[PDB]
Write a protein that binds this DNA or RNA. Structure first.
Lengths: 778, 548, 141, 479
RNA sequence: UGCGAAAGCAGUUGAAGACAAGUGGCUUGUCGUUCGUUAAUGGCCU
């Protein structure tokens, strides 16, 4: 009765091609600017901008029709690169969109109501392994193609020509060049500009594509002044650029933060200077009097050119990556946030905002997970320094070779994310770096985003030396599982080169929400329980046995345990009972368990399963000594002690499995675990890997890593479901892509999470007059 | 599923009262009663009585007589009140009701004319019951239930003659059908090893359970779901479980089949005619504290042989789970042959255990984690190496690295060989703090003592250390404190342990003042090496020299 | 507020406390003052409680703390915990007050079963102090 | 986009304007207007003084009594007032007009100690002198009472009624022995007596079901529907002199009752959770007659304390042209009877300060300067030091300063090392500045005076911390 | 860079190609180069 069904949405899937872009955004509007056609990795979303909802999705698994283009195993780099508005084949005749992914697969997708099940899966001849773009105007569409050196691609401008041979589009081969380090297209597409690197120095060209009009090249050594002839490469290096639609103005945003403006005929130099970090986002208006700029500071800054001044937008809560205006009269700013508070994933954030009061309409998220390391081609953006958030200019080949060969020669690849599920409304919390993301996966979006520290997350853009002021990372938060409290615990760091910079220090607090609001109010905080400088790593919440989920027992890596129960005579949270066995050793590989009726407390220390009672906080030493065994000892270093119900149990160590019965105080069964995992985990991570059902056990997940023919970029989910304390392998669900965690949603189902972040689940005459008046309505 | 087991009318009171059981007796006239009092008069007795009941006040009692009637008796005053003989066949197991709770004239023939606890308060004739043999009176909404050998189940309530429910319950010849403590079921015992709890809301068997020992007298206590089953040839009542606010411990019901073991409390000494010794003192069933001891209906010590995955052909998609021997030899036949080789006819030499450890599974002369280990195989291997064979070089370097020895390690203080004891006091985590404490309070003070103090801080809790060191020989600790005051942080935290263990006053002043000087140079070395730790333009005119 | 952006962190009016403490689970020698301390711990009155406990002298503090009752020694030690919680600038002469209840009364607080529950102010405050005492000695050295 | 983040007993201690007026003798007890106690009377010797809720002095008084007077009591309508003296000729006369006397009728020749009207009837007045009998006089025909309420063993001294139950009069004598007579009875027996021990000081009825009596060094409660006590309190130096009760006023306590006990502090218990004080505030000695005003004082609310010396302490809580106006007339309509209503307001927040906006604009230097001034708060300075250490780099905050700017930092760490919560962090502050600024002190040898002064006081404080740690080590040993 | 723990433990620290500069040639420094080792006065609004 169980089966794989991958359901919910994932990443926005932009042009994740380092310098192979000038736009890196094809989230288009209709020509009636009311609905937003945005691609994903998992869907196509059509949004009503007047309500910020989805009027129609085109999911990437519901049709084999489309997903023959992308449902394969290792070639899942089928990313989506261009959207046009009308039928390309027929001349302008009604409104259904066309779609190109990275392989030149022409798709003609339906746009209104319900789709017709014949998408014209057209394909041009040469588009075998490429698509940079096509560029659009009336009639003529001109494809930018890439062939193969010094790590420079070759860009060619061919034309889609299609007049009467109704089953073949043929290219027309206008332009050729073989050297690109950075390129860009205009906001109307009628002009582009690239660089060439061709030594007596590097050079920059600006070319037309729809005529013979303006085709020129010039070395940028003239644009580089004597100050940047002298000083370092962060001043010599172009970070971003922009061109005008007219063809008389070229912005070059240099990596220091200066924004040069050069002309076309006379080639003057003109300098714009406010940005302190590097600049990544440069675009002109359609009239070319305002220059939109977004850098690593959290501000959206737009320059009026004929005053050379600026209007700000202070707190975008992230890092701006690309921005332009795209209204035909120029009323809508499309842009990409990134918010690199987690360096693991390139988790962007698509949004547009009005030009009226700069209010944001339809912040389009993906699910933003909290991994442990970089995933699969996760490069870092170009800053001036090799900071903790990104690498510098000189470490491009260095960091890409380091990450690629690290994933080749590594053996430690867990990145197991911790989440939670809310028993009020069944949305899943991604506890972010010093924050949360409450994702309601029923319609694959968010609801809010609360900050969870009193740090420097919000009120300051992180600049070149403040980037190493990382924010206090939270580890986890516990729901009171009536859905009432976020009991969060977080670790915090100081800036380095300080005597108090040694320790990473700890703080917990308590959050209450009503069912009305989506935020949480802070009830109380507790700064370093169990004394100072002690981790509080494993805390367990309680069922409705004691006071309708008021029990939360805090633990330690040292092995101390305290009990914590809410009360109302003291309108506050406080503790109940105290224990700190101060071992002079420590071990952060600790699990815990607790009985669902409230009887047994299980401390799974470093290979000793000590047993306390509930009532008196101590080791149960009764008055009989007839198999009242209140201390187990397991085979090796364990990571989980899990109780599925009050009779039997699963403990998990590094090498094998074991099952325990406690009414019948013995061991039961065993499965192998080291034939599955080699060295993949860090200690304590099997706890957040597997999570029990209320009835039907748990799903131990096989961690695999598919070898080359070192691991290649094929991956696994061959998950085998277990029922009722290690009894049946009743389903081996096969899948070609990775996994991080599996949780239980309360309809006896098991939601799993992909790294390519797709959430899924294994679970259970007057009529003619009326019609013609409906046609005459508009 | 059992509880704490021991012990090898008025149905709610107990001792300190007048007479809570004027109880019927087999091989007597009808009945008798005894105090640990009141009279036991004639209630139109002298019949085939096997049971007896009253009006639960011990002054208007009766004697349940097999003549279809129940006439009142006088047990306190002497003025018995009149009654009415209803049936004419057998009422030797009759019982009066409360003030209009449950009374009907279904004596032995299913003739259930409903009435009250009176002779003149009569109700409608609910005589539609078939030929039944199991008549029970429960207090859910007071209800007489009939299980019939025409097999059927039914229940009626004596409020306005309301037949609640009933179906065709296939009830055969059983042993003991008591009601359940939750009142919505009944433990109806099958003959030898079985007692089915049947949910008495629809006469359906809800859980047909098996019994660990012989079940002959099953009676459900004033508990959550606990019953007592007394065996055939004994007065032993096993306490099993499947009323929670003030849970009763004794004087719940009067039912057993032991050696005249009626009036069944936990302390069932004061009986009605028996006058016997006493038994259990256990309360009702707890939440989850009794079930960790009460391991009945299943008693075994077993484990699987580490079952692998359901074989996955992935020779094109290998898992990167080893560069070494992933699937090792878990051959129990090879392990049995190797252990029989170690305890075989070569046993005169240490080669008999060395070559057996070689011909056993791939343990690299010291290393665990090839868990070729069932509990019986493990303890027989440990017995053949702990027999009358510190000798072997492979096996006794393989066994400091074992987390499982489980209390035969009292021998470790007595056996005194240096390097095996050093490996055992650094690695194997089964050597208790008693042995650790006397080996610490040895006064030869070498790296053995350093390593066991490191082990006491690596494994042993401070509160157990304190309450174990509270009462021991004072001469060892005072001699060691004098030695260390004359002439390392493991020893200083052990000094903290013993100098919290000293108590308040039970010492002298000169030795402790010299210890105060020792700890004065301790505070000065502490402050001086933490000091070591956190230690670790142009003026107006000058006269210049330059060459010409 | 724009619901396309993140909501802001705040504490509001949360009760700030670290993870330590919980409440729910004829002369012939010297005549030093007793009955004024008795009527002082009848009420909670700062003026007369200061005129009895403004003391500084060793034998005076000894005789006062011992010659009062052991049924008030618990709440007297808790009131001295209140004093060292209100201020620790002037801590020198009143540390003597805090310490002599622990010195001269030894059996009564031990026979009292709930020490750390009702006494959750004093040793919790002194261990809040002595938490950063390794850090304080490191900083000062 | 978004904004920028920002980083009971209090009610009874916001009672102030506690002024003093010394009488010429002691204050027996007081009274309050029952319909509106915006005036109140105190019973001075040979005069009764009546004060308002505004001017807080005598607005009217009567002083043609000839002996010391004892009892002043308003009728429930609050128009006339009764006064009993030591002569035993109890006088009733109209209030808000002192110079008229309605009727002065003699009681027994013993001094009439207490005299109070019926709580709901407007024409029958209870008097009690030391004749061992109390009287329910009728002011329509004040020639003989209706009831010679006899049945006392000695010295009937304090009267009260039961509020909702009319026929029950609770009198109290100097025998314990709180009697409660029925007015339809013979006037010789109560239906039962309440067994107080001491001579009762006075008794009030705080419910129609529960009364509180006080006499001796503890006060008692008494149930009347079952003759039961549920409560006593005796934490007073002398006997609880007077009682008072109030219902439904503006506090975190719904209803209060106070007991005043000749020992400075007056205690404020509550029948919400069985009679615990919030906090009792002292006075200038033997407090004899002390009460706060009743419910309908409407904001402005006075507590008065007439001591046995006689000084009254009064502590009170107190909460262009027509053509231009026609030009700007439509300012208050605010959208009542028309279709839709917009609301797009930004809120004028709390007052952002100069140091706060210095943090907002990275003005770290003048943020430090605004921290280290005596005009700003000390805990504000601690919090801004903690927050800017957590926020920014102290190196780039101190990247160009000298010792003339560094000196208030050291001058305030001089007193802030002794703190409990900021000791090691201000030690880290001086640690950074001496970590990177030794060249300044070796050029200018000035501020090492404060460095060595700091050193000796921090040796004192580290000795203090060491001895505190070993004293809690004594607690650990005697656990 | 690897393990591990809020801890120490082991190593990279290469080469080629091209260019720049000082002196056809030589000498000093780099690379939005293939390969290997796990190693710029420019700062946040209504």
């Amino acid at each position: 009765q169980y089966k794989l069904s991958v359901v919910s949405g994932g990443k926005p899937a932009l042009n994740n091609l380092s310098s192979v872009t000038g736009n890196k955004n094809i989230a288009r509007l209709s020509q009636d600017q009311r609905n937003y056609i945005i691609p994903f990795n998992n869907q196509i979303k059509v949004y009503s901008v007047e309500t910020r909802q989805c009027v129609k999705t085109l999911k990437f698994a519901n049709n084999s029709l489309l997903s023959g283009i992308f449902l394969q195993e290792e070639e899942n780099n089928e990313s989506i690169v261009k959207i046009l508005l009308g039928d390309i084949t027929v001349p302008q005749q009604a409104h259904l969109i066309t779609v190109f992914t990275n392989n030149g697969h022409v798709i003609v997708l339906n746009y209104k109501g319900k789709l017709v099940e014949s998408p014209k899966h057209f394909k041009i001849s040469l588009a075998d392994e490429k698509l940079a773009n096509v560029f659009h105007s009336e009639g003529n569409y001109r494809i930018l193609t890439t062939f193969k050196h010094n790590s420079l691609q070759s860009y060619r401008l061919y034309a889609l020509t299609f007049d009467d041979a109704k089953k073949q589009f043929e290219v027309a081969h206008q332009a050729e060049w073989h050297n690109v380090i950075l390129s860009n297209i205009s906001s109307n597409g009628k002009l582009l500009a690239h660089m060439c690197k061709d030594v007596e120095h590097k050079s920059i060209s600006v070319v037309s594509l729809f005529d013979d009009s303006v085709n020129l090249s010039f070395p940028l050594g003239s644009i580089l002044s004597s100050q940047t002839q002298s000083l370092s490469y962060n001043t010599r290096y172009v970070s971003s650029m922009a061109i005008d639609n007219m063809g008389q103005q070229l912005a070059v945003g240099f990596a220091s933060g200066v924004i040069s403006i050069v002309s076309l005929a006379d080639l003057q130099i003109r300098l714009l200077k406010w940005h302190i970090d590097s600049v990544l986002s440069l675009s002109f208006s359609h009239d070319g009097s305002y220059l939109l700029s977004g850098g690593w500071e959290k501000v959206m800054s737009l320059w009026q050119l004929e005053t050379n001044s600026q209007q700000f937008l202070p707190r975008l809560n992230g890092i701006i990556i690309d921005c332009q205006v795209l209204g035909p009269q120029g009323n809508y700013y499309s842009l990409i946030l990134q918010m690199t508070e987690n360096n693991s994933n390139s988790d962007y954030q698509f949004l547009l905002l009005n030009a009226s009061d700069l209010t944001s309409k339809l912040s389009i998220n993906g699910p933003l997970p909290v991994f442990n390391s970089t995933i699969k081609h996760i490069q870092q953006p170009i800053s001036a320094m090799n900071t903790k958030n990104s690498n510098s200019i000189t470490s491009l080949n260095h960091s890409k070779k380091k990450q690629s060969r690290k994933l080749i020669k590594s053996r430690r690849q867990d990145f197991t994310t911790n989440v939670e599920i809310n028993p009020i409304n069944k949305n899943l919390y991604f506890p972010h770096i010093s924050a949360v993301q409450i994702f309601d996966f029923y319609k694959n979006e968010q609801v809010n985003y609360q900050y969870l520290t009193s740090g420097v997350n919000n009120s300051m853009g992180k600049v070149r030396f403040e980037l190493n002021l990382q924010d206090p990372i939270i580890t986890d938060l516990k729901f009171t599982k009536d859905g009432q409290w976020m009991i969060t615990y977080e670790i915090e760091y100081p800036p380095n080169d300080l005597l108090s910079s040694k320790d990473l220090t700890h703080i917990l607090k308590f959050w209450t929400k009503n069912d009305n609001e989506t935020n949480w109010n802070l009830k109380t905080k507790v700064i370093n329980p169990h004394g100072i400088s002690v981790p509080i790593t494993k805390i367990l919440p309680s069922p409705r046995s004691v006071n309708n989920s008021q029990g939360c027992l805090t633990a330690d890596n040292n092995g101390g345990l305290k009990f914590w129960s809410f009360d109302s005579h003291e309108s506050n949270w406080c503790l109940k009972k105290i224990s700190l066995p101060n071992f002079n050793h420590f071990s952060n590989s600790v699990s815990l368990a607790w009985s669902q009726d409230g009887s047994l407390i299980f401390h799974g220390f470093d290979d000793k399963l000590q047993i306390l009672d509930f009532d008196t906080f101590k080791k149960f030493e009764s008055l009989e000594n007839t198999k009242t065994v209140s201390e187990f000892t397991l085979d090796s270093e364990i990571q989980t002690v899990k109780l599925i119900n009050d009779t039997n149990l699963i403990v998990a160590t590094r090498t094998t499995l074991n099952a325990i019965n406690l009414l019948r105080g013995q061991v039961i069964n065993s499965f192998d675990l080291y034939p599955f995992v080699n060295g993949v985990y860090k200690n304590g991570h099997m706890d957040r890997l597997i999570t029990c059902d209320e009835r039907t056990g748990n799903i131990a997940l096989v961690i695999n890593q598919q070898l080359t023919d070192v691991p290649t970029i094929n991956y696994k989910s061959r998950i085998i479901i277990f029922d009722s304390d290690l009894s049946t392998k009743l389903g081996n669900f096969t899948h070609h892509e990775y996994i991080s965690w599996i949780g239980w949603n309360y309809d006896t189902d098991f939601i799993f999470l992909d790294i390519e972040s797709t959430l899924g689940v294994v679970g259970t005459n007057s009529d003619i007059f009326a019609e013609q008046l409906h046609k005459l309505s508009s | 599923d059992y509880v704490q087991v021991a012990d090898g009318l008025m149905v709610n009171k107990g001792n300190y009262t007048l007479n809570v059981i004027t109880k019927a007796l087999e091989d007597t006239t009808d009945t008798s009663n005894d105090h640990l009092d009141n009279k036991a008069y004639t209630g139109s007795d002298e019949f085939l009585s096997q049971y007896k009941i009253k009006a639960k006040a011990k002054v208007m009692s009766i004697k349940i007589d097999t003549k279809n009637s129940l006439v009142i008796a006088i047990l306190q005053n002497g003025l018995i009140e009149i009654f009415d003989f209803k049936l004419t066949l057998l009422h030797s197991f009759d019982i009066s009701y409360d003030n209009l709770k449950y009374a009907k004239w279904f004596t032995e023939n299913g003739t259930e004319y409903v009435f009250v606890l009176c002779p003149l308060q009569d109700d409608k004739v609910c005589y539609k019951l078939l030929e039944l043999t199991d008549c029970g009176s429960g207090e859910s909404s007071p209800i007489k239930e009939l299980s019939s050998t025409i097999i059927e189940g039914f229940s009626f309530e004596n409020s306005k003659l309301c037949y609640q429910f009933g179906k065709l319950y296939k009830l055969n010849q059983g042993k003991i059908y008591i009601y359940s403590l939750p009142h919505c079921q009944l433990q109806q015992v099958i003959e030898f090893p079985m007692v089915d709890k049947l949910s008495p809301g629809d006469d359906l068997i809800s859980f047909q359970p098996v019994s660990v020992n012989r079940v002959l007298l099953t009676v459900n206590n004033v508990i959550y779901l606990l019953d007592l089953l007394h065996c055939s040839t004994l007065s032993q009542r096993e306490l099993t479980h499947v009323v929670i606010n003030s849970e009763k411990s004794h004087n719940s019901k009067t039912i057993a089949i032991g050696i005249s073991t009626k009036n069944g409390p936990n302390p069932t000494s004061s009986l009605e005619i028996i006058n016997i010794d006493v038994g259990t003192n256990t309360l009702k069933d707890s939440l989850g504290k009794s079930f960790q001891v009460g391991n009945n209906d299943s008693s075994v010590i077993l484990k699987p042989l580490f079952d692998d995955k359901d074989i996955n052909d992935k020779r094109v998609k290998c898992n990167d789970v080893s560069g070494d021997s992933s699937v090792p030899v878990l051959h129990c036949n090879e392990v049995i042959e190797k252990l029989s080789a170690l305890q075989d006819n070569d046993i005169t030499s240490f080669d008999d255990i060395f070559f057996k450890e070689l011909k056993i599974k791939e343990e690299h002369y010291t290393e665990k984690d090839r868990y070729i280990s069932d509990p019986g195989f493990l303890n027989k291997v440990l017995d053949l190496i702990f027999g009358k064979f510190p000798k072997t070089l492979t096996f006794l370097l393989t066994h400091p690295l074992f987390p499982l020895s489980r209390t035969r390690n009292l021998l470790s203080l007595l056996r005194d060989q240096p390097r095996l004891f050093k490996q055992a006091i650094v690695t194997c985590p089964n050597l208790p703090l008693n042995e650790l404490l006397e080996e610490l309070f040895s006064i030869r003070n070498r790296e053995l003592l350093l390593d066991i103090s490191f082990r006491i801080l690596q494994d042993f809790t401070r509160d157990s250390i304190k309450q174990e060191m509270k009462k021991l020989s004072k001469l060892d600790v005072q001699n060691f404190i004098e030695f260390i005051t004359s002439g390392s942080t493991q020893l200083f935290q052990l000094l903290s342990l013993v100098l919290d263990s000293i108590g308040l006053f039970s010492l002298e002043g000169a030795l402790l003042e010299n210890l105060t000087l020792y700890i004065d140079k301790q505070v000065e070395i502490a402050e001086r090496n933490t000091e070591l730790w956190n230690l670790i333009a142009l003026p107006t005119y000058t006269m210049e020299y330059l060459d010409i | 507020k724009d619901l396309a952006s993140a909501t802001n962190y705040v504490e509001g009016n949360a009760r700030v406390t670290s993870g330590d403490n919980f409440k729910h689970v004829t002369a012939t020698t010297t005549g030093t003052v007793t009955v004024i301390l008795s009527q002082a711990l009848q009420s909670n009155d700062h003026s007369l409680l200061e005129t009895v406990l403004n003391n500084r002298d060793e034998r005076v503090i000894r005789d006062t703390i011992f010659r009062l009752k052991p049924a008030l020694a618990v709440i007297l030690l808790e009131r001295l915990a209140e004093r060292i919680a209100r201020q620790t600038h002037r801590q020198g002469p009143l540390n003597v007050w805090v310490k002599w209840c622990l010195i001269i009364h030894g059996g009564y607080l031990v026979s009292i079963p709930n020490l750390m529950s009702t006494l959750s102010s004093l040793h919790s405050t002194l261990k809040r102090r002595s938490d950063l005492l390794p850090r304080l000695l490191a900083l000062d050295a | 986009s978004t904004a920028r983040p920002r980083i009971e007993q209090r009610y009874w201690r916001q009672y102030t304007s506690a002024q003093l007026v010394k009488e010429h003798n002691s204050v027996t007890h007081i009274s309050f207007n029952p319909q509106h106690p915006h005036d109140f009377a105190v019973t001075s010797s040979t005069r009764v003084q009546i004060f308002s809720s505004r001017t807080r002095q005598v607005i009217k008084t009567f002083s043609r009594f000839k002996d010391v007077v004892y009892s002043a009591s308003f009728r429930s309508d609050g128009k006339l007032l009764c006064a009993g003296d030591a002569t035993g000729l109890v006088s009733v006369y109209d209030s808000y007009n002192p110079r008229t006397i309605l009727l002065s009728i003699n009681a027994s020749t013993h001094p009439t100690h207490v005299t109070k009207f019926h709580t709901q009837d407007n024409k029958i007045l209870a008097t009690a002198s030391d004749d061992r009998v109390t009287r329910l006089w009728d002011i329509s025909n004040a020639y003989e009472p209706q009831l010679e309420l006899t049945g006392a063993t000695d010295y009937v001294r304090t009267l009260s009624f039961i509020p909702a139950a009319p026929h029950l009069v609770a009198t109290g004598s100097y025998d314990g022995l709180i009697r409660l007579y029925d007015t339809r009875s013979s006037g010789s027996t109560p239906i039962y007596s309440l067994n107080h021990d001491q001579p009762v000081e006075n008794v009030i009825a705080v419910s129609p079901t529960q009364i509180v009596s006080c006499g001796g060094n503890n006060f008692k409660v008494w149930d009347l529907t079952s003759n039961k006590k549920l409560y006593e309190r005796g934490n007073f130096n002398k006997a609880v002199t007077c009682l008072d009760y109030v219902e439904n006023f503006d506090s975190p306590m719904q209803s209060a009752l106070i007991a005043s006990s000749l020992d400075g502090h007056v205690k404020v218990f509550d029948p919400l959770d069985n009679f615990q004080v919030k906090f009792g505030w002292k006075f200038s000695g033997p407090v004899l007659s002390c009460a706060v005003s009743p419910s309908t004082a409407q904001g402005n609310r006075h507590l008065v304390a007439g001591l046995s010396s006689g000084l009254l302490a009064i502590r009170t809580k107190k909460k262009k042209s027509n053509n231009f106006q026609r030009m700007m007339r439509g300012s208050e309509y605010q959208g009542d009877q028309e279709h839709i209503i917009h609301n797009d307001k930004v809120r004028s927040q709390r007052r952002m300060r100069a140091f706060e906006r210095n943090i907002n604009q990275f003005k770290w230097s003048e943020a430090l300067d605004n921290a280290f001034v005596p005009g700003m708060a000390k805990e504000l300075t601690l919090t801004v030091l903690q927050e800017l250490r957590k926020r920014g780099k102290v190196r780039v905050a101190l990247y160009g300063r000298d010792e003339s700017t560094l000196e208030p930092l050291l001058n305030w760490c001089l007193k802030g090392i002794e703190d409990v919560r900021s000791a090691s962090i201000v030690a880290d502050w001086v640690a950074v500045v001496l970590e990177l600024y030794g060249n300044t002190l070796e050029s200018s040898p000035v501020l090492q005076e404060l460095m060595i002064d700091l050193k000796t006081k921090v040796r004192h404080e580290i000795h203090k911390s060491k001895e505190a740690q070993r004293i809690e080590g004594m607690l650990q040993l005697l656990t």
